[model samples]
Target: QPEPDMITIFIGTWNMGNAPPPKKITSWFLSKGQGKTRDDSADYIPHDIYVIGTQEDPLSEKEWLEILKHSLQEITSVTFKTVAIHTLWNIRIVVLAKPEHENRISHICTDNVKTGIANTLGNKGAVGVSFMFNGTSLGFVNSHLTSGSEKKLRRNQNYMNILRFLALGDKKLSPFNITHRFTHLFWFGDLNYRVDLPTWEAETIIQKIKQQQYADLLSHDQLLTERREQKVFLHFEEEEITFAPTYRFERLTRDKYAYTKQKATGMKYNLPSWCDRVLWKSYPLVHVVCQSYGSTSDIMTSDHSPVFATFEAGVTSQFVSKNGPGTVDSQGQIEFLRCYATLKTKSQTKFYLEFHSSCLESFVKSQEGENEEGSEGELVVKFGETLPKLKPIISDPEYLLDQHILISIKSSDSDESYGEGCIALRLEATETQLPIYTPLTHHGELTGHFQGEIKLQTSQ
Candidate 1:
């Protein structure tokens, strides 16, 4: 049968530039960036994963994290947690996924490269994050390159540096890294590549934007020029932008693009460019379907408007079992980080196991059939000379077992007051009524025999 459909993911990039965040962000968080009006009736479920990138953000790392945590929880009604977060100076990128699906995400790693001022300044660089989803590996990069009408070469070089930094793939069957590793890659952020025309010529193209002649102007975008030159980001893919330029936006209002202004003058006069972007490249091993891509022009905060892309990405083949819990990992014999064991026993002895229906007491039959006076069966076990109280087993009612006991036992005696006598207690199975005890090694000596065929031994 053909593989099931992939999960939906939303990727957003914003340059806060030290601006304060809005108090109410939930409505904006859930709306599709399809130029939908706020009064329009648009309703949709939350995506399975969210990858957010921020550059020149005002909030501290911790502050932004808390905001993301709170906003997502309040809006989606799903328990989502940050799976991976990477920050380099003013640049931050984070991945938030559903708690239940995190087990399928592994090998999470990040890398960054500074391409500004002797490579010491963070004003320009890229943060790259990679992880294994289910079994397919994926990579994502968020970058802010040097800005200048004539700095396209510098921006291309910065892209090359980040690409090299993420290039640590192995030839083994289990590969790791950018080139030889990731089945898909998402590249986004403020690339800073500008219009390839003169300031006057660029202004002419900008004038046509209101008339919806965007394609006529995109022909002059420096990013496309660089791609034709094969200067960087080889083979990476980007969807055609039907929306207008996303950068040089006016503050505190929609429908108006801001002109470039010097901080010193507070004046304005700059041509616009579709600098903020989202792009992806994938291998044949996985399939990626782009749902939507556009500038969130409704958000009128920063001078540079934010961009968002929604897509459904997953491995093309069913390499892993669908019925099982996410991908499996091992710590030892147990194939998980923690473990839960079921309490089971063999049948045949006089002592029967009974637990409280509602905090009911567990009865121990010192003599055969002693538990018949109380509830059904009573759990009677010993640890050396000390007796531990058997707490009522707590589990989901739907999953409670008929014969298995999930009780927790705490020593009734003092913490340090326990003996090392042979654990010779035999348990009775309800169905077969057979008696069972702890497994006997018999590797050395079978010192003593318990009731029935069970035996115990200790260091002689």
Candidate 2:
């Protein structure tokens, strides 16, 4: 019971251009005041990280990421868990963390940058993530720039090609790659920046800022005119989008900010922009505060409208362990099957396994040293030098592919030892879930190895 100096981040963004998502976004994940509709908190307290984002091309991003991890573990009744997620092609970025700080959230990095056609499609992109909590240092970016206004310098050259291809971790002595390598960074998405006015005077200044005069139309906001004369996102900071204009409305005027369709560059309408945003930056190594920023027209579901922000950053911590617990990453902590094949040209290459009940109760209370499959605990499959048969498939499937383990990778003489390697899963475990008792355990990733590395071990 020790480890937590301060932390409570929640970043959101949306551009479901591929639509279909909303069986509940938990009131945009438990909103606490920000644009209309209030009333929630029944002593509601939950959010130790949620970084979410989405853009186009969604059809079955792994079944909408398991239906957004079963609607965020059915609205946090399961105490938050997605552990980590990232994507670029259509730009997705997810992170849920709260399994008791999930090993103080370690170094999980991801990056992406593409500006369509030959720039390598991802539809004007930017997708990122950087980690390290407890000792603080975080980063997040979920972009999608370049839309109109003559591509405003191509969306500021797609934010410097997403800061030279968004990065974190040793891209040359990493500190997660800086603008002060994150002590809180959280740049949101769909920064199509526009609204310098014109189009019947930005539709009478968006109907006079919908009677609220949104910070007097944010000085004609073109992302604050590209952060004051094209310095572009310098020390990024934002919060005070007193709501209104989450871009081109009219899906039945979901709260007005109308029109679309009209752009041969001579554009005829469609300006009522704020173009979805949510920015932040707090580095001096830590200490941030920006409680609430709005956008959420009750699942307008595309044509855009889903922005959010909530922070209370912190740093000045401790915890190498005392509840940092088993940190199994690199997608290691097993979830199996990386592209097994079998059309019956002499078959035998199966997969299925799941273990993370804190490494399966530390491998069923392992006593270690007992090989030759005598069973004090057994689970091994290192395909490449071939070796299979680590069976134990049952079902417990809940929020977190529950209780199960099974494997099959046979050449049995004829798929010509079917080429492909780097698949590992080693064993031995103790220290059930929390209480750092350690043992050998590697619990994730192996989808037909396209280059491998995932080993989670805990042995003592």
Candidate 3:
């Protein structure tokens, strides 16, 4: 059996509150109580990718980048390179990856949205960065939604505005929907949704933090309630929360919540809430498993605790072209005929093929019972002229090779099968003047024949 190509990712989000970064911030990246010690620990695991999102950040890009570089060196020896970064007002998102993957990442782009003060101010909004890693397209969104414990509806509206306006790549070519444009998406930041209880009730629930009884407090969480009602984050999923609330903490206090009274109204203000979060959604072929999720309680620089989540994400294997031993084009417009089939008779028939879009290796692995069957691709033959040319929308070109599309041939009028056939995409072998022929089989016996031809086109 073959194994999946998996990579570990460490993601952290913080609400800095305009405070300068601490001198040593390794606790946010590495395991707590282990960053300062140099002793060899068997439990310490390094990640291949690192992403940090910040709201109300005060430092310049250069200063923040240097701080992160120094902190990573203090914790581990792994060398990393900046993949992409974007900033909108005080909101920023940074992505870093190992140097070995520098050549494999491409199609980098960034975009931002403003949802504050008549939708013209960046004080509350989102910043995003998207790229192709290995053969998978990934997107990250760092947002700061509307604030206030009583402004749940406004926070929900801010999310909708970001989804409606933020665009990544060239607008004319890419899909308008941000979630539909990528295979994996990570949306995290200071969302500002609050606890639905009054100050007195929330204060009572906070007393059970030492016992780790989070269910009672979470029942009144505005984000969870809105999600349950299908009002926001429609398809996203979040890990179970075992940590305390991340917002409205006293500055420079490790475990103290901020309980202040308004001067004019004589009413309690600044109730504790879970304003920072990390959520994710992915395509069916890919898998994302959470390894750890918690907040770094030791760093008390701001009124909010920084939250981090580690994930083990699986990606398709690298594509290897069969047209001799040269590198395939990485950045270009790719257009080609994916599949073509013809039946013995002119009657209408339906064809189905199962092949992984990321790599041919996985497709072969599925045949050996190592991996599940790839996603199904379907086509119907009506006039029997020629199959339409296939131009992949979001997938890379080389990754489309070596797919064995399973064919289920049946007459249009009846469920009985004429036979089963397959269309193998061997670009180099079939992209010529003549079409390649494959035999159709029924119950392990040859029944008929089908021909397929592929054509490749590339443009700068």
Candidate 4:
């Protein structure tokens, strides 16, 4: 079977500033060839997945979802289904996917974390949605961080708290950090990080944008500053900011900054900043290409313009081998021996091991018991206890010994990894031993052990 092509994803974010939805939002999605002939599908690429996030939205969750669904359908020939949608106070996130690919998506989950006053209010926080799409895990987070020019540190703390508290999937089995569990992660919203320059300096930067100069403004941007220092958004990558700042705009105006004069000092009160942004991170094996990154000026109801980015994300294609009997095929399975673990620290940390091999086909994880045929290729074990056998099917048994299998031990509550080990299938069964034991190490030090054997059954 041929490998699947990369999937196109469109992510848009806006700080509505409590404004009501407009009658038409078609311009926000089809920015390239609006008012032109409708025959040109080349002007806009129909996305396979759409993630729309809003902050300070005045409408209800269903209201926003319906509006988005209608607007999206108005522009593209492809039909989309609302796969997931969540709202927390004024923050909202909605995910839409093509109907043809709906069956490939699984493990859908939603969660939220508050970083507002005393970490209890939903006024400033994040809401996230995660799902397994075509054998790859994807997570999207829409956050509204603390606002204010002098609250840079506070915004950083909000990011840390979200990572520490936002848990997806079953709380008893999954990790707390959303960033650690997915192959591709996208975070977009009104971060509220301002330009560090004074009003006078910011005015000069704004003037340069008229001449199409953005490097000067981005140099003093607070988000880039913190990112360079590794203070926030660690390991995240953002496409070049080619568009003008998306915040502090005059309501109902066309690309005008909200720079009003202070009554007392007669000085500008607002310094235009790139408060809204889109950033992404991915695992080493997956590839994500940012095709377009810019802000749309069509919507003028709010003081913040909408920002959008399109990406071509790689996914593991689903392929099933159908070789005849006696030939290596999808019927091969890995039988895990009764697993055991020993902990040096005396803490009630529910530990689990995740087993994944390159030769196995990534399948949908069933929500039922541990030994099910559609399990997530994992084993949950406790100290001083040994679980029974776990047989996970392998898709291609021919390269079983050539490919490596990875075993990772992690804490269920915190998702912290105690150790991990990778071994080829050749180590699984020796001539004398039925099951081979492999050592688990963290930082080159042995911490635990795993025993497993492979079985290739032929159909009679």
Candidate 5:
């Protein structure tokens, strides 16, 4: 993979509680693991990631490390071809192998011994884990909380703990900063919660816990795809004999995994809930949507429905921010590096080389899929086309903020007779004068500069 920037994709936790929950494991596998990483050969190698917070019990929390270890070994063991791959567990991570430097970026990710310390007087299940890759300090945290009794409290505190750990703990945690000058913070998990309810009391409570000054994730970070009333169902397949109604699949006679062949008077178990949730910062969130399998379509397998969705992380500013801070200035921003672009600069003419070009596009196109060739790593990006005129059709100003840069181009193969895939430029300046203007058919003419004073508008 030629590296300037690479797409770090993550797919997780099949819950793998029961094998064959779905007749086909491929769909389960894609959703559970191999749908996001890059693999030119085995089609099994995930784009390296730091997986983290999901579990299936009896699987034993202690065994998590080993399952994780085995998963990675299986991925890299393939000696065949480079099959597309990109996926990781809530607490799992992978770093693509590189030739010269070992592709071994020094990384450190661990679970917080006691992730939750409550307000007033409370204790969270203390269930969650974090992942990181090499020196690129970005972190992803996932968790599952205690159930029953104080279900509300459990959910509430789980979120509270999540926020607490993410913002880096009220100054006491010292290194509480989720990511250093280099990395970023990806906070996701089963969350066992939601944000767009008619009465958002939970969000209000979290607001108080997130701290009066700090912002609530939903206020700015929580991403909701669309109102496409999609639901996930469980096709639990068990051979354990006794129905356990655990998740309504087992009975008094069965232990667990007894969803089938289990009889009960009040089958209050086969119900569905939105226990899984993905929470992250606002960056990489513009065009986001959760991919859900319709009950009629039959793609779902778990009792607990899955919400599949993705956000932009390649060209968008937010995608770049997902790594760390705003892409800093070209010359001095190196200090805030979250992850390094891995392109080996062989040709000097190309001012900058990018890594993981394919994954980045996938990220842009992350609608969730099961195409066999889809899992491969497309990080090999070769920038600077031979055609000179196409390079700067829309000249970038010397000080264009990283967030404002846009790509404008037309595709020759575009199906449109003329306007197939044409790039239209749009700019928004909250305070100052709009710089040179560029008009588009969809929206009116856009200004380049701000509307207010220059010094008042510029922020780096």
Candidate 6:
């Protein structure tokens, strides 16, 4: 069909068999494929759909933690992105997917294996947060599950712990929370689970959503597991592309690199495999594509290869791409400002709360033990007392008293979502000024107030 805005997604993973990464895979290239450039899609795309697992060589949680920490620090390339910091940054390549789509990724969230509610589970784990056009926020998580250990049963439990924590179903650390701001949730990574017609399929996770559902963007109402096709179309290629293997066990090591190392260039490890995949809830971008490199077989870089994808949310409506795809030119610069400026209109800030991190930590510390019944119940009462303590300066009485503020305690991972389900305090001046007062710039700082515990919900 004719080319409108479309997104191409790429998913991949490699065991790295705990071996040294292929030099070709780790380094950069002056050009892509051949001198002329193998494919334009390959040239300009972000590594949005990435899930690389099994970086642990000695292959232990502790060992992998050390490796993950170092790898994420270096943002030179996308060779080994098993860890979060490295994974998110290396993804800078495909992050733009399209220059116009910048406005689409509203909140960027990241959590490494060390932190997050997991309380230190396996080697490395991470989750990146972004939103789709349909007002649906998506969570992209990456993890390296405990590869089968000598102690089979216990090792399995540890792996299960990782998944359990991911679902946020654990009592101690549950990411599974109820909030209307983010209605759509898309979670995928090297879940270490295969797609088969079994009782415990990953798709089941989406099936149980109370009100929401996960439908394939390319396929109508099909769960991601049910569909077996890439998101993008090949040059003038009508049909979607499908490959046999999602991963290769034989190429788990970097022993065969010297053969074609010189000929290889940047992002040479893209191979065909279903092993690395994505699970997305409905997003803003309507049309899309998915892709991976074909050179992965002949050249072995890291135990796992790299993959990239691109998404277009249409520039006509969004500030980032309103005039069309953004560029480094002056028009693109103006468009960048336009994208951020749109935030004031589409979204609003609620009351701002500022306090030392230490004070926030006190609540968690004091609430640790005591009886769960009236003890935690008593904590809820404090909010009522604190509510009146903070005065509402907003001129509009309805804005402050209409809704009690929502006090959502957040660690790093959960901070981005704070905006997802928060009250909207318009940054711009409005016609009527009775319900709430406009923000005033004092001492070069713009400050506004929401008085007590109030929530901003969508207008009925």
Best by TM-score: 4
lDDT of 2 at 300: 68
Q: lDDT tens string, model 6, 108-176?
A: 444333322454343545333333432233344444433211222332343334333433211221222
TM-score of 2: 0.32
TM-score of each: 0.63, 0.32, 0.68, 0.71, 0.40, 0.35
Ranking by TM-score: 4, 3, 1, 5, 6, 2
- State how far residue 395 of model 2 sits from its true place (Å): 26
Question: Which tens-of-lDDT digit does each residue in 8-103 have in candidate 1?
Answer: 777778887568666655544563454322223323366777888888877877898888878888876776878778888888898988786666
Off by over 4 Å in 2: 4-8, 13-129, 135-139, 145-165, 169-188, 191-245, 249-255, 260-265, 268-306, 309-460
- Write the residue-wise lDDT of candidate 2 on 142-261 in tens digits: 888877754667777677667655666334322123344455678888888877666657667767767867766788778887787734776567866777777777553477655544
Candidate 5: count of backbone clashes, pairs at least 3 residues apart or interchain: 75
lDDT for 30 in candidate 5 is 33
Model 3 clash pairs?
A: 352-406, 353-405, 353-406, 354-406
Clashes of 4: 0
lDDT of candidate 5 over 170-206, digit per residue (tens): 1222212332211234444443333332322433433
| lDDT for each candidate structure | 0.56, 0.56, 0.65, 0.68, 0.28, 0.28
Under the 3 Å rule for N, CA and C atoms, how many clashes does model 3 have? 4
Q: Which candidate's lDDT is highest?
A: 4
User: Which regions in candidate 6 have their CA more than 4 angstroms from the true location?
Assistant: 1-14, 26-107, 112-121, 124-126, 129-138, 146-186, 194-241, 246-248, 251-274, 283-295, 301-460
For each of the candidates, the C-alpha root-mean-square deviation to the true structure, in angstroms, is 22.0, 17.6, 12.6, 9.5, 19.7, 17.2
- State the weakest 10-residue window (summed lDDT) of model 3: 364-373
Candidate 3: list runs displaced more than 4 Å.
Answer: 1-4, 31-44, 119-122, 169-173, 263-268, 318-320, 323-460
Error of 3 at 89 (Å): 1.0
- For 69-157, candidate 3 gives per-residue lDDT tens digits of 77776667666799988899899999888777777788888999899575536499999988877656778889999887878888888
Error of 4 at 399 (Å): 9.7
| Candidate 4 C-alpha lDDT tens digits along 81-136 | 88899988889999999788788888899989888675546499999999877656
